[model samples]
Target: METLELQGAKLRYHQVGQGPVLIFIPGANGTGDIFLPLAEQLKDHFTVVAVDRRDYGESELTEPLPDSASNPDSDYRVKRDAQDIAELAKSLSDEPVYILGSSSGSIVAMHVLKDYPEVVKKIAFHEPPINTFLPDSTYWKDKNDDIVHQILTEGLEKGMKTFGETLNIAPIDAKMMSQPADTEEGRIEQYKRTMFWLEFEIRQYTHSNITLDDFTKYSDKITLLNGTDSRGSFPQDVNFYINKETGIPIVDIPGGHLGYIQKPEGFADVLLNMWG
Candidate 1:
């Protein structure tokens, strides 16, 4: 992992392989290094550059986190996150760059296409949860709000348990949370980072302000991906937007919402094919 100092942000990114640059933006509460496993599988085909967005992983926060414990989204914004990606891409290469973004990070990818099209060669938004774009958005918003409230009042453990149940992560999340934080894989710092993600970053994602029109202008450079077995309306809503604007269908990959984590090798293969 290397750190880049640019535009008032200290960005940390992990680079591997030696081919076309593909910048990966992580989902809510995730670190850039989460892609290390996937990159190990993909490095043979592409140079994978996975980065930590502000306030997560090793990325330095420019602003202090709010103490009120009410607003989880007060620190990060979509536009700023997009700017970070653009700057990092420019710092790495003069040519257009490829990108992969999942879940909340997908919205940031879309914004990059909307605001910095010149820097992007192609972008894949995998299972973006732009609930506001759907008719049943209120249900999801309320559900997310309930989850955030729990994170603020109770803690990440309780919140993550509920989050796993809500998202159907099953034994993976259960087993992960059940382990001791001091173990080789799980650390107190990592859990603390997840807490910030649940308590600060996730709410902003639920309140996404990106519109269909925002995507219309960049449709040509964009493709959406959804897991073959992923359930729920979020993926379908994303597909609806792509169909309406770009005439492109959702690129089905193996694994569900957490495909990158659940099926790293297969996910890497799918992305390599798409970006090939």
Candidate 2:
């Protein structure tokens, strides 16, 4: 574990192996630990640093939690998170770094390319749910909002079950989701993290922080990847959009959305092939 000071926040990350810096940014409700399996294999060839975004894991939250009911946009913005990576990379190496982001973290990587292109040599965006890029963007956004509503109404387990089915995303481990937290105290932390994502982070796709026009400019610096069995139109649509507009064909890899979690060894091989 290592830490770096980024403005008002202290970003924490786990580092392994030694080679060209390859940072891993996880999706919603995930800490750097989500990359533990994937990073373990890739570490041999790359200096793998899996980062915990603010309010996620070892990293300290720099702001107060927001009310999900209000539909607030908290400080957990992708652009700011992108800066955290940008600053961390700048602090670690003089040369530009490589980044691979999955899910919402892909948005963070996109912002890095949009704002701090000089900080990144290349980036691989694996199955980013960039809802706005879809043909029916609003429909998907509403569906995501419903997922949040269910979490607050029906309960975590039920809500997550509904979410997986609705979004066609695989369920995160029940234990990691804290589905059956032994005590309320243990549960509160997990619940808060999920809400933080729903209220603030998830809505970031609607922002103008990164425009479609911006992608073509940095297209050469980016690559799109999706799983062979990934079940979702957004992933496929986003993949196709990038390939059509940027000429970066979507690399169809094995495994679903949770490829890293499901098959680390195989996912690592795919990661190396995609980014190597």
User: Which candidate number would show the highest lDDT if scored against the true structure?
Assistant: 1
TM-scores of the candidates are: 0.51, 0.52
Every candidate's lDDT: 0.78, 0.78
Q: How well does candidate 2 match the true structure in TM-score terms?
A: 0.52
Q: After superposition, which runs of candidate 1 have C-alpha atoms over 4 Å from their true positions?
A: 62-76, 154-276
Model number with the top TM-score? 2
For residues 1-276, write the lDDT of model 1, one tens digit per residue. 689885556788899988889999999865788788999988988889998887678888665544532244553467778999998899889899999999888989988998999999989999999887799998998999898656554665676777776656546435755466666345645666687777689888877798777777777777788776565535556686668776765687877666688788999998899887
Candidate 2 C-alpha lDDT tens digits along 1-276: 899977667799999988989999989965898888988888878999999997678898665544442433443467679999999899888999999999989988988899999989999999989877789988988998888767675675566666666566644432344355688665655676776767787668545386567778777777677877674635667678767866876776666775677678887888798777
lDDT of 1 at 85: 92
Candidate 1 minimal-lDDT segment of 10 residues: 67-76
**Lowest lDDT 10-residue stretch of candidate 2:** 170-179
